[PDB]
Design a protein around this nucleic acid. Structure first.
Ligand SMILES: [Ca+2]
Ligand SMILES: [Ca+2]
Ligand SMILES: [Ca+2]
Ligand SMILES: [Ca+2]
Lengths: 129, 130
DNA sequence: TAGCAGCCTGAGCTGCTCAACTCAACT
DNA sequence: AGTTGAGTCCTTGTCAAGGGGCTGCTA
């Protein structure tokens, strides 16, 4: 890479023996707080996230939120649950969801969903606006 | 406002149902995690040199965390251009940031004084090879 | 084998300015 | 004020694919 090519040459220009990318330095990123805003709250108590591109971070999000707010029912309406997780993955968003317990549907919110009976939502645990 | 969002909004109202759109936020934590950083160069002085072109938010935090977590390590930056601003129309240059934080830096080339400096013990004890 | 971490300034043009961008929230 | 979070499938080839692309742990 540009500077890497140049500074390597600039050092050898002075006879000095450098070490290039040999040693790795480990370190921690401390825990942090974040907030997720699901797209839709039906009067059923059902949260609906509309998702087009659905990447690694986002998956973890839904997984963390689920561990962290076991009472919340958050379900995904995919643009296309056929999409693959990443370049030539065998796995579809679909495959991933079912394997993880995530209720999902495609392009539209199904009737059964809306037709479901009311559940208490803990606004206690959430933040408005 | 966005493709499916436009569509599923209309699809609900098509049925009379009153939905709530983006009103409630759900807080959550990301737990601590382990990572590793590989500085570009280790001089025989014991000086670590990172060559940096574009140097963004994450990277700054990296260098700041590593410094908190490995007080013995001397890691300094040779910028492609320390004139670069942190982000769209920031008043701050990578340079400004470095000095305000204690980060020793230079531009395009490793200065002589740097290499000319005397030897320091490096704790390879705390590091990982390869 | 899968899955994800950890990397990475040159064009291109007005010595700066662009690789997306736009509101919200945090500090 | 200044910095960072959080959120955003619709365009380019045979539905599908698909984001930059490579190397290289870690289970
Ligand atoms: Ca959203
Ligand atoms: Ca969404
Ligand atoms: Ca490097
Ligand atoms: Ca570098």
């Amino acid at each position: 890479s540009g500077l890497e090519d140049k500074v390597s040459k600039q050092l050898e220009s002075k006879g000095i023996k450098f070490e290039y990318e040999e040693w790795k330095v480990p370190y921690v990123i401390p825990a942090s707080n974040h907030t997720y805003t699901p797209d839709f709250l039906l009067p059923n108590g059902i949260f609906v996230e509309t998702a087009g591109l659905w990447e690694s971070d986002d998956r973890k999000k839904h997984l963390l939120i689920r561990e962290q707010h076991p009472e919340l029912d958050i379900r995904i309406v995919f643009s296309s649950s056929r999409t693959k997780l990443y370049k030539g993955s065998p796995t579809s968003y679909g495959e991933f969801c079912e394997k993880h317990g995530i209720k999902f549907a495609d392009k539209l919110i199904p009737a059964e969903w809306i037709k479901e009976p009311k559940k208490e939502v803990p606004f206690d645990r959430l933040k408005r606006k």
